[PDB]
Symmetry: D4
Subunit: 121 residues, 8 copies
Amino acid sequence: GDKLILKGLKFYGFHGAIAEERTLGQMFLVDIDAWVSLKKAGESDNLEDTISYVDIFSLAKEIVEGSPRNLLETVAELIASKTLEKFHQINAVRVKLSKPNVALIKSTIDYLGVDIFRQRN
Amino acid sequence: GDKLILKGLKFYGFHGAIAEERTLGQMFLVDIDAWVSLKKAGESDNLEDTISYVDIFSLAKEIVEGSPRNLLETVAELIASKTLEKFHQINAVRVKLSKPNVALIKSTIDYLGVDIFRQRN
Amino acid sequence: GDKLILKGLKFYGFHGAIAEERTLGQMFLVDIDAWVSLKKAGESDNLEDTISYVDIFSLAKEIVEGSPRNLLETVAELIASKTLEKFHQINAVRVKLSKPNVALIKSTIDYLGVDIFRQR
Amino acid sequence: GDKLILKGLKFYGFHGAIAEERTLGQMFLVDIDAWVSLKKAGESDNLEDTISYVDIFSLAKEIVEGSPRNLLETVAELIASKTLEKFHQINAVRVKLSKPNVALIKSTIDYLGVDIFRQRNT
Amino acid sequence: GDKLILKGLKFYGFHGAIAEERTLGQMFLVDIDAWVSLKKAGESDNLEDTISYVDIFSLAKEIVEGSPRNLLETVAELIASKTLEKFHQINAVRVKLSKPNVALIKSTIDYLGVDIFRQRNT
Amino acid sequence: GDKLILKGLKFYGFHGAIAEERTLGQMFLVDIDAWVSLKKAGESDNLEDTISYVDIFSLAKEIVEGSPRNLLETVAELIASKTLEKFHQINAVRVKLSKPNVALIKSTIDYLGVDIFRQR
Amino acid sequence: GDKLILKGLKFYGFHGAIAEERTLGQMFLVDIDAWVSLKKAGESDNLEDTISYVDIFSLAKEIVEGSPRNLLETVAELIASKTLEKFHQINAVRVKLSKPNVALIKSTIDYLGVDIFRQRN
Amino acid sequence: GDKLILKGLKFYGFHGAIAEERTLGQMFLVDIDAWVSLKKAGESDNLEDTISYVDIFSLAKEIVEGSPRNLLETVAELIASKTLEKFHQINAVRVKLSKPNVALIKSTIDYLGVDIFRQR
Ligand SMILES: Nc1nc2[nH]cnc2c(=O)[nH]1
Ligand SMILES: Nc1nc2[nH]cnc2c(=O)[nH]1
Ligand SMILES: Nc1nc2[nH]cnc2c(=O)[nH]1
Ligand SMILES: Nc1nc2[nH]cnc2c(=O)[nH]1
Ligand SMILES: Nc1nc2[nH]cnc2c(=O)[nH]1
Ligand SMILES: Nc1nc2[nH]cnc2c(=O)[nH]1
Ligand SMILES: Nc1nc2[nH]cnc2c(=O)[nH]1
Ligand SMILES: Nc1nc2[nH]cnc2c(=O)[nH]1
């Protein structure tokens, strides 16, 4: 089906399992794929017929910059469940949350993270 | 099956919900996947046995740079419908229309956009 | 299941529908996913149990740099058929052939190309 | 299913069939996708309800930087096996191992490598 | 002489002549070079003997994201003058302020910007 | 002293020595450094006391996408002369014109081009 | 001016004033330019007529990954004085030490750092 | 003043002190800035009034892929020395020769190399 895409959202947060990460913070990367039929809106050109990717972006921002949690799993789940709950027309959502800079990892990487898929339950 | 790929097409355009957006304009990124059996052409080396990506390119350009619409959905929808309409050989099209620079977003992102798939009817 | 991956191969060739493209040539981008079981080789660690990706690399290179063809479809199709023919161990080949610099396109793009999948 | 992602891990190693490769060594790139349910940890926010991607990273680092083998196939296989062996919770694992720099090739490429998918079979 | 470096600072502001630019806003790219002797701080390992690049960062962030101006020149001028006014130890400052996304330009570019060098004249 | 910077300008043109290049064309990359005092404008905030970078952009754009020339030297010369001729306050101009995709070159490169400095 | 060039050296270390930085560590970027006449070596092809850039790299690596300091100024100063002290043929050194990931900065940057130049004596 | 620029040239060569480096080889990155007045050619649009950067590219390629040298300094010295000797119009040459992949270094860098300037 059709989908709204929010790619490479960069936000500063305070999530982490190491106590120090929760008071120092770091950058996070977020990809969000929201499944929704966009044909009605594509034929009417009326924003009310779709869901604004700005409201989905805003929701993601509030969560990532929110209260510090220990795991990316928790934050991604929050983003996913929050998105489905706030926007009833969304059928499913895929959230990829990552840390491009992992503390104590000495060598070079792109990022380490989680990748979850959630359908309307 | 097989597919013609048009990746990272950048076009300046005036689409947007905000009034000033339709005035100033901005850059839009387009990804197009045209589903069509390419075996015939690959075994004949005759351009007439396939769809020229140049023609798909120009059709997409004309749209994106055209009369301003409010939503990316409407623009991607036109590209899909018009592509299927003009090239009967194509069986289905996937269109990804995104804005690398979303007005008012103060944080870094790659892009925000829509992603639709349309089979021939 | 398993596969050998050749990503981002760059070769200068002379393919194209416009006559001048064929005499001037240009750069082409090649991606190849060769479907072949790799567990055997993964456990013996001997070369006889797999195919050299360097052999797959050379075959594509020779084709892309070979005789000029009008379409990318023809080149990709050649790579696919040639690969399956050259290595019986291969079960399927996915070939992506693109042009990062398309003549007469006056605006920025990643590339325009083809993407075929051919099973034995 | 949910999965843990380790993308673009860069490690120096000495694998290869050519003796000069085992002497000189080179950089290897690896992507790992660990299939594992993250719902429980997503609800508890307790690191114990999941598998630390740091642990997977360090197991992978140890393998690639370890005893030199002839083929990528073999190293990718060790990574998959040891991962499954060390982390019961993980249902499957996809490992992509590649060489950005293939010796003797005069032209530019991104990388040549392997892509395997493994689960605990009989 | 020595210098603190602030490279590729990205900020969202509303500078510009065009009316639509003032309301919509856009991203701005900023490089800052601050000429200042670092030998002392490099020997005492004391943050107070040098100028914290965070303070220089904050000053610039406040300018660029602050009150709207028609020209990058004006903004660049303000950053330079304010930096020199705030930290008497800096002897000179070079500011490079650019717009990576210039409205109404149909083709691609890296950016269009200004590059000024200002030395303490007071 | 101060200068207006136009970095990484991409324009499609038909310059070149090879007859095929003239027919097909290709992308060209342009960097322009214009030395001119920005203090006055920096204090007045009036676009009138400076040079619009869009004016420089347009001049170079009309040149590169224009009539085909043989050399990058010629095109770059046109840009520099035209810029100085149009804005006397410009003390000097530096023009970097390059070709990222050079015909017949098989290996990878960033680009080949010219880099001139012109004053009055 | 003839010189040896070490560009973009990435090393993990623990420098910084914040306690969390000292604990967690982070990536550091170093560029080193070593001015020395290379004409003799360029004509003799004798390593002895030049300075091995591997020894200068190795020296820098030990410093950045070594004993933690509060300031980048200090680390850079150490690399400079040590390089000049150990390799007498070096006429002057330029050290650019930077932090690509500055803690508690919510916006994007390339990096913040120091750039120092030190001549023999 | 003016100069011809050859940026980011990637050539495969076999230079190095370690024996294995000479048998295996590696990629080398070369930047070349050749100083030469381009004013005449810029006004005449005649290739003969300038030096073709394709020839400069060719020379450099020949040297980097030729007989192995122990040091980068030696290769860059030849590149400069040979360019000045083959093209009398060049007044000076700056050669940057680097190794993006240094054997046994496992920390990630951009490159290690040399940077020399040779005047007529
Ligand atoms: N899986 C997982 N592992 C971690 N190791 C350290 N932090 C995390 C996290 O958030 N998720
Ligand atoms: N989904 C969607 N959301 C928007 N929000 C603002 N503009 C758009 C648009 O074009 N599509
Ligand atoms: N599909 C396709 N279209 C082209 N248009 C010009 N050349 C080609 C080609 O090789 N394939
Ligand atoms: N498949 C495969 N082919 C190679 N050719 C050279 N080395 C290798 C390797 O490790 N795996
Ligand atoms: N030089 C300069 N030119 C412009 N043209 C439009 N806006 C500007 C600006 O801020 N500075
Ligand atoms: N110097 C120079 N050499 C070329 N060789 C082919 N075209 C050109 C050009 O425009 N300038
Ligand atoms: N100049 C400078 N400023 C800092 N601010 C916080 N840490 C540092 C440092 O190491 N150097
Ligand atoms: N300066 C320099 N140092 C090296 N160390 C190892 N090889 C080289 C070389 O070619 N030049």
